[PDB]
CSV table of all heavy atoms in Angstrom, one decimal:
chain,number,residue,atom,x,y,z
A,40,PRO,N,-34.6,28.3,23.7
A,40,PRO,CA,-35.2,28.8,22.4
A,40,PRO,C,-35.6,30.3,22.5
A,40,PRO,O,-36.0,30.8,23.6
A,40,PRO,CB,-36.4,27.9,22.3
A,40,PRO,CG,-36.2,26.7,23.2
A,40,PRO,CD,-35.3,27.3,24.3
A,41,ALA,N,-35.4,31.0,21.4
A,41,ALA,CA,-35.7,32.4,21.3
A,41,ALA,C,-37.1,32.8,21.3
A,41,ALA,O,-37.9,32.2,20.5
A,41,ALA,CB,-34.9,33.0,20.1
A,42,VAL,N,-37.5,33.7,22.1
A,42,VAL,CA,-38.9,34.2,22.2
A,42,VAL,C,-38.9,35.7,22.1
A,42,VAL,O,-38.3,36.5,22.8
A,42,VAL,CB,-39.6,33.8,23.6
A,42,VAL,CG1,-41.0,34.3,23.6
A,42,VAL,CG2,-39.6,32.3,23.7
A,43,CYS,N,-39.6,36.1,21.0
A,43,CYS,CA,-39.6,37.5,20.7
A,43,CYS,C,-41.0,38.1,21.1
A,43,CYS,O,-42.0,37.7,20.7
A,43,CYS,CB,-39.4,37.7,19.2
A,43,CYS,SG,-39.3,39.4,18.6
A,44,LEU,N,-40.9,39.1,22.0
A,44,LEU,CA,-42.1,39.8,22.5
A,44,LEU,C,-42.3,41.1,21.8
A,44,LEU,O,-41.4,42.0,21.8
A,44,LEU,CB,-42.0,40.0,24.0
A,44,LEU,CG,-41.6,38.8,24.9
A,44,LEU,CD1,-41.4,39.3,26.4
A,44,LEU,CD2,-42.5,37.7,24.8
A,45,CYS,N,-43.5,41.3,21.3
A,45,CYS,CA,-43.9,42.5,20.6
A,45,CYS,C,-45.0,43.3,21.2
A,45,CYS,O,-46.2,42.9,21.1
A,45,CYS,CB,-44.2,42.2,19.1
A,45,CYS,SG,-42.9,41.2,18.3
A,46,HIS,N,-44.7,44.5,21.8
A,46,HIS,CA,-45.8,45.3,22.5
A,46,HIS,C,-46.7,46.0,21.5
A,46,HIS,O,-46.5,46.0,20.3
A,46,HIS,CB,-45.1,46.3,23.4
A,46,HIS,CG,-44.3,47.3,22.6
A,46,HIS,ND1,-44.9,48.5,22.1
A,46,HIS,CD2,-43.0,47.5,22.3
A,46,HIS,CE1,-44.0,49.2,21.5
A,46,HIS,NE2,-42.8,48.6,21.6
A,47,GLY,N,-47.7,46.6,22.0
A,47,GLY,CA,-48.6,47.4,21.2
A,47,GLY,C,-48.6,49.0,21.4
A,47,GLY,O,-47.6,49.5,21.7
A,48,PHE,N,-49.7,49.6,21.1
A,48,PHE,CA,-49.9,51.0,21.2
A,48,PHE,C,-50.5,51.5,22.5
A,48,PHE,O,-51.6,50.9,22.9
A,48,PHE,CB,-50.8,51.5,20.0
A,48,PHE,CG,-51.0,53.0,20.0
A,48,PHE,CD1,-50.1,53.9,19.4
A,48,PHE,CD2,-52.1,53.5,20.7
A,48,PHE,CE1,-50.4,55.3,19.5
A,48,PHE,CE2,-52.4,54.9,20.8
A,48,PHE,CZ,-51.5,55.7,20.1
A,49,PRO,N,-50.0,52.5,23.2
A,49,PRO,CA,-48.7,53.1,23.0
A,49,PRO,C,-47.7,52.7,24.1
A,49,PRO,O,-47.6,53.3,25.1
A,49,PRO,CB,-49.1,54.6,23.2
A,49,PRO,CG,-50.3,54.6,24.2
A,49,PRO,CD,-50.8,53.1,24.3
A,50,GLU,N,-47.0,51.6,23.8
A,50,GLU,CA,-46.3,50.9,24.8
A,50,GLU,C,-44.8,50.8,24.6
A,50,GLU,O,-44.3,51.8,24.1
A,50,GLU,CB,-47.0,49.5,25.1
A,50,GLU,CG,-48.5,49.6,25.5
A,50,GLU,CD,-49.0,48.2,25.9
A,50,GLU,OE1,-48.5,47.5,26.8
A,50,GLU,OE2,-50.0,47.8,25.2
A,51,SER,N,-44.2,49.8,25.1
A,51,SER,CA,-42.7,49.7,25.2
A,51,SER,C,-42.3,48.3,25.5
A,51,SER,O,-43.1,47.4,25.9
A,51,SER,CB,-42.3,50.6,26.4
A,51,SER,OG,-41.0,50.4,26.8
A,52,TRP,N,-41.0,48.0,25.3
A,52,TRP,CA,-40.5,46.7,25.8
A,52,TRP,C,-40.8,46.5,27.2
A,52,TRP,O,-41.2,45.4,27.7
A,52,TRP,CB,-38.9,46.6,25.6
A,52,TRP,CG,-38.1,47.4,26.5
A,52,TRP,CD1,-37.5,48.7,26.3
A,52,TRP,CD2,-37.7,47.1,27.9
A,52,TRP,NE1,-36.8,49.1,27.4
A,52,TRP,CE2,-36.9,48.2,28.4
A,52,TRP,CE3,-38.0,46.0,28.7
A,52,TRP,CZ2,-36.4,48.2,29.7
A,52,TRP,CZ3,-37.4,46.1,30.1
A,52,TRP,CH2,-36.7,47.2,30.5
A,53,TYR,N,-40.9,47.6,28.0
A,53,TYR,CA,-41.1,47.6,29.4
A,53,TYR,C,-42.5,47.1,29.8
A,53,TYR,O,-42.7,46.7,30.9
A,53,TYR,CB,-41.0,49.1,29.8
A,53,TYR,CG,-41.0,49.3,31.3
A,53,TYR,CD1,-39.9,48.9,32.1
A,53,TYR,CD2,-42.1,50.0,31.9
A,53,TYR,CE1,-39.9,49.2,33.5
A,53,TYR,CE2,-42.1,50.3,33.3
A,53,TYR,CZ,-41.0,49.9,34.1
A,53,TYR,OH,-41.0,50.2,35.4
A,54,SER,N,-43.4,47.1,28.9
A,54,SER,CA,-44.7,46.5,29.1
A,54,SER,C,-44.7,45.0,29.3
A,54,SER,O,-45.6,44.4,29.8
A,54,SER,CB,-45.6,46.8,27.9
A,54,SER,OG,-46.2,48.1,27.9
A,55,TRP,N,-43.6,44.4,28.9
A,55,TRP,CA,-43.3,43.0,29.2
A,55,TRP,C,-42.6,42.7,30.5
A,55,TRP,O,-42.1,41.6,30.7
A,55,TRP,CB,-42.6,42.3,28.0
A,55,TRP,CG,-43.3,42.4,26.7
A,55,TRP,CD1,-43.0,43.2,25.6
A,55,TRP,CD2,-44.4,41.6,26.3
A,55,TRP,NE1,-43.9,43.0,24.6
A,55,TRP,CE2,-44.8,42.1,25.0
A,55,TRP,CE3,-45.2,40.6,26.9
A,55,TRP,CZ2,-45.8,41.5,24.2
A,55,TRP,CZ3,-46.3,40.1,26.2
A,55,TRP,CH2,-46.6,40.5,24.9
A,56,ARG,N,-42.5,43.7,31.4
A,56,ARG,CA,-41.6,43.6,32.5
A,56,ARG,C,-41.9,42.4,33.5
A,56,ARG,O,-41.0,41.8,34.1
A,56,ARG,CB,-41.6,44.9,33.4
A,56,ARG,CG,-43.0,45.3,33.9
A,56,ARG,CD,-43.0,46.8,34.2
A,56,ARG,NE,-44.3,47.3,34.6
A,56,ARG,CZ,-45.2,47.8,33.7
A,56,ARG,NH1,-44.9,47.9,32.4
A,56,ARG,NH2,-46.4,48.2,34.2
A,57,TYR,N,-43.2,42.0,33.5
A,57,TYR,CA,-43.6,40.8,34.3
A,57,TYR,C,-43.3,39.5,33.7
A,57,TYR,O,-43.3,38.4,34.3
A,57,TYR,CB,-45.0,40.9,34.8
A,57,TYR,CG,-45.3,42.0,35.7
A,57,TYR,CD1,-46.0,43.1,35.2
A,57,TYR,CD2,-44.9,42.0,37.0
A,57,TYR,CE1,-46.3,44.2,36.1
A,57,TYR,CE2,-45.1,43.1,37.8
A,57,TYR,CZ,-45.8,44.2,37.4
A,57,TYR,OH,-46.0,45.2,38.2
A,58,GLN,N,-43.2,39.5,32.3
A,58,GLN,CA,-43.1,38.2,31.6
A,58,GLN,C,-41.6,37.9,31.4
A,58,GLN,O,-41.2,36.7,31.4
A,58,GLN,CB,-43.7,38.3,30.2
A,58,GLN,CG,-45.3,38.3,30.2
A,58,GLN,CD,-45.9,39.4,30.9
A,58,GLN,OE1,-45.7,40.6,30.4
A,58,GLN,NE2,-46.7,39.2,31.9
A,59,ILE,N,-40.8,38.9,31.2
A,59,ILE,CA,-39.4,38.8,30.9
A,59,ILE,C,-38.6,37.8,31.9
A,59,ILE,O,-38.1,36.8,31.5
A,59,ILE,CB,-38.6,40.1,30.7
A,59,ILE,CG1,-39.1,40.8,29.4
A,59,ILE,CG2,-37.1,39.9,30.6
A,59,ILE,CD1,-39.0,42.3,29.5
A,60,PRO,N,-38.7,38.1,33.2
A,60,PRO,CA,-38.0,37.2,34.1
A,60,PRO,C,-38.6,35.8,34.2
A,60,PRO,O,-37.9,34.8,34.3
A,60,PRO,CB,-38.1,37.9,35.5
A,60,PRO,CG,-39.3,38.8,35.4
A,60,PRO,CD,-39.3,39.3,33.9
A,61,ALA,N,-40.0,35.8,34.2
A,61,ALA,CA,-40.7,34.5,34.3
A,61,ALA,C,-40.4,33.6,33.1
A,61,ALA,O,-40.2,32.4,33.3
A,61,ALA,CB,-42.2,34.8,34.4
A,62,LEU,N,-40.4,34.1,31.9
A,62,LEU,CA,-40.1,33.3,30.7
A,62,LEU,C,-38.6,32.9,30.7
A,62,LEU,O,-38.3,31.8,30.3
A,62,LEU,CB,-40.5,34.1,29.4
A,62,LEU,CG,-41.9,34.3,29.0
A,62,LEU,CD1,-42.1,34.8,27.6
A,62,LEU,CD2,-42.8,33.0,29.2
A,63,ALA,N,-37.7,33.8,31.1
A,63,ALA,CA,-36.3,33.4,31.2
A,63,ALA,C,-36.1,32.3,32.2
A,63,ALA,O,-35.4,31.4,32.0
A,63,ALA,CB,-35.5,34.7,31.6
A,64,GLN,N,-36.7,32.5,33.4
A,64,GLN,CA,-36.6,31.4,34.5
A,64,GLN,C,-37.2,30.1,34.0
A,64,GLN,O,-36.7,29.0,34.4
A,64,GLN,CB,-37.4,31.9,35.7
A,64,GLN,CG,-37.7,30.8,36.8
A,64,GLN,CD,-38.4,31.3,38.1
A,64,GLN,OE1,-37.8,31.3,39.1
A,64,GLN,NE2,-39.6,31.7,37.9
A,65,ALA,N,-38.2,30.1,33.1
A,65,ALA,CA,-38.8,28.9,32.5
A,65,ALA,C,-37.9,28.2,31.5
A,65,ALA,O,-38.4,27.2,30.9
A,65,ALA,CB,-40.2,29.2,32.0
A,66,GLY,N,-36.8,28.7,31.2
A,66,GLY,CA,-35.8,28.1,30.2
A,66,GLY,C,-35.9,28.7,28.8
A,66,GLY,O,-35.7,27.9,27.8
A,67,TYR,N,-36.2,30.0,28.7
A,67,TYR,CA,-36.3,30.6,27.3
A,67,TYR,C,-35.4,31.8,27.2
A,67,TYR,O,-35.1,32.5,28.2
A,67,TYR,CB,-37.8,30.9,27.0
A,67,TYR,CG,-38.6,29.7,26.9
A,67,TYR,CD1,-39.4,29.2,28.0
A,67,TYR,CD2,-38.7,29.0,25.7
A,67,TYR,CE1,-40.1,28.0,27.9
A,67,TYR,CE2,-39.4,27.8,25.6
A,67,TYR,CZ,-40.1,27.3,26.7
A,67,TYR,OH,-40.9,26.2,26.5
A,68,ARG,N,-34.9,32.1,26.0
A,68,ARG,CA,-34.2,33.3,25.7
A,68,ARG,C,-35.1,34.4,25.2
A,68,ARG,O,-35.7,34.3,24.1
A,68,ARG,CB,-33.0,33.0,24.7
A,68,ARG,CG,-32.4,34.2,24.0
A,68,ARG,CD,-31.6,33.8,22.8
A,68,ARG,NE,-30.9,34.9,22.2
A,68,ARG,CZ,-30.1,34.8,21.2
A,68,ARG,NH1,-29.7,33.6,20.7
A,68,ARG,NH2,-29.5,35.9,20.6
A,69,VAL,N,-35.4,35.4,26.0
A,69,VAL,CA,-36.4,36.3,25.8
A,69,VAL,C,-35.8,37.6,25.1
A,69,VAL,O,-34.9,38.1,25.7
A,69,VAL,CB,-37.2,36.8,27.1
A,69,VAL,CG1,-38.3,37.7,26.7
A,69,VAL,CG2,-37.6,35.6,27.8
A,70,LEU,N,-36.3,38.0,24.0
A,70,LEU,CA,-36.0,39.2,23.3
A,70,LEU,C,-37.2,40.1,23.4
A,70,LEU,O,-38.2,39.8,22.7
A,70,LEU,CB,-35.5,39.0,21.9
A,70,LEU,CG,-34.8,37.8,21.4
A,70,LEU,CD1,-34.6,37.9,19.9
A,70,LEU,CD2,-33.5,37.5,22.0
A,71,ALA,N,-37.2,41.1,24.2
A,71,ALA,CA,-38.4,42.0,24.2
A,71,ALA,C,-38.0,43.3,23.5
A,71,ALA,O,-37.2,44.1,23.8
A,71,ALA,CB,-38.7,42.4,25.7
A,72,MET,N,-38.8,43.5,22.4
A,72,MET,CA,-38.5,44.7,21.4
A,72,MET,C,-39.1,46.0,21.9
A,72,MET,O,-40.1,46.1,22.6
A,72,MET,CB,-39.2,44.4,20.1
A,72,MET,CG,-39.0,43.0,19.5
A,72,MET,SD,-37.3,42.7,19.0
A,72,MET,CE,-37.2,43.9,17.7
A,73,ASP,N,-38.4,47.1,21.5
A,73,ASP,CA,-39.1,48.4,21.3
A,73,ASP,C,-39.5,48.3,19.8
A,73,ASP,O,-38.6,48.1,18.9
A,73,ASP,CB,-38.1,49.6,21.5
A,73,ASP,CG,-38.1,50.1,22.9
A,73,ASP,OD1,-39.1,49.9,23.7
A,73,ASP,OD2,-37.1,50.8,23.2
A,74,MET,N,-40.8,48.4,19.5
A,74,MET,CA,-41.2,48.3,18.1
A,74,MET,C,-40.7,49.5,17.3
A,74,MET,O,-40.4,50.5,17.9
A,74,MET,CB,-42.7,48.1,18.0
A,74,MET,CG,-43.3,46.8,18.6
A,74,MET,SD,-42.4,45.3,18.1
A,74,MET,CE,-43.3,45.0,16.5
A,75,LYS,N,-40.7,49.5,16.0
A,75,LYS,CA,-40.4,50.6,15.2
A,75,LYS,C,-41.2,51.8,15.6
A,75,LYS,O,-42.5,51.7,15.7
A,75,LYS,CB,-40.5,50.3,13.7
A,75,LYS,CG,-39.8,51.2,12.8
A,75,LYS,CD,-40.3,51.1,11.4
A,75,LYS,CE,-39.4,51.6,10.4
A,75,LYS,NZ,-39.8,51.3,9.0
A,76,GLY,N,-40.6,52.9,15.9
A,76,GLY,CA,-41.3,54.2,16.3
A,76,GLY,C,-41.3,54.5,17.8
A,76,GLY,O,-41.8,55.5,18.3
A,77,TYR,N,-40.7,53.5,18.6
A,77,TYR,CA,-40.8,53.5,20.0
A,77,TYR,C,-39.5,53.5,20.8
A,77,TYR,O,-38.5,53.0,20.3
A,77,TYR,CB,-41.6,52.3,20.5
A,77,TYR,CG,-43.1,52.3,20.2
A,77,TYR,CD1,-43.6,51.8,19.0
A,77,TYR,CD2,-44.0,52.7,21.2
A,77,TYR,CE1,-44.9,51.8,18.7
A,77,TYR,CE2,-45.3,52.7,20.9
A,77,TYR,CZ,-45.8,52.3,19.7
A,77,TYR,OH,-47.2,52.3,19.5
A,78,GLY,N,-39.4,54.2,21.9
A,78,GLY,CA,-38.3,54.0,22.8
A,78,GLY,C,-36.9,54.3,22.1
A,78,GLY,O,-36.8,55.4,21.5
A,79,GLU,N,-36.0,53.4,22.2
A,79,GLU,CA,-34.7,53.6,21.6
A,79,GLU,C,-34.6,53.0,20.2
A,79,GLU,O,-33.5,53.1,19.6
A,79,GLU,CB,-33.6,52.9,22.5
A,79,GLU,CG,-33.4,53.5,23.8
A,79,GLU,CD,-32.3,52.9,24.5
A,79,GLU,OE1,-31.2,52.6,24.0
A,79,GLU,OE2,-32.5,52.5,25.7
A,80,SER,N,-35.7,52.6,19.6
A,80,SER,CA,-35.7,52.2,18.2
A,80,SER,C,-35.9,53.4,17.3
A,80,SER,O,-36.3,54.5,17.8
A,80,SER,CB,-36.9,51.2,17.9
A,80,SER,OG,-36.6,49.9,18.4
A,81,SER,N,-35.5,53.3,16.0
A,81,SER,CA,-35.7,54.4,15.1
A,81,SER,C,-37.2,54.7,15.0
A,81,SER,O,-38.0,53.8,15.0
A,81,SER,CB,-35.1,54.0,13.7
A,81,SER,OG,-33.7,54.0,13.7
């Protein structure tokens, strides 16, 4: 199942670095966003 992670201010998808592998290992499809205004997003 799809799990969408949304960081805050002033952060990044990378702020989820400890959750991404753990949630994936637990049987989830993890989508960690750069929110609008951040990183590689517009």
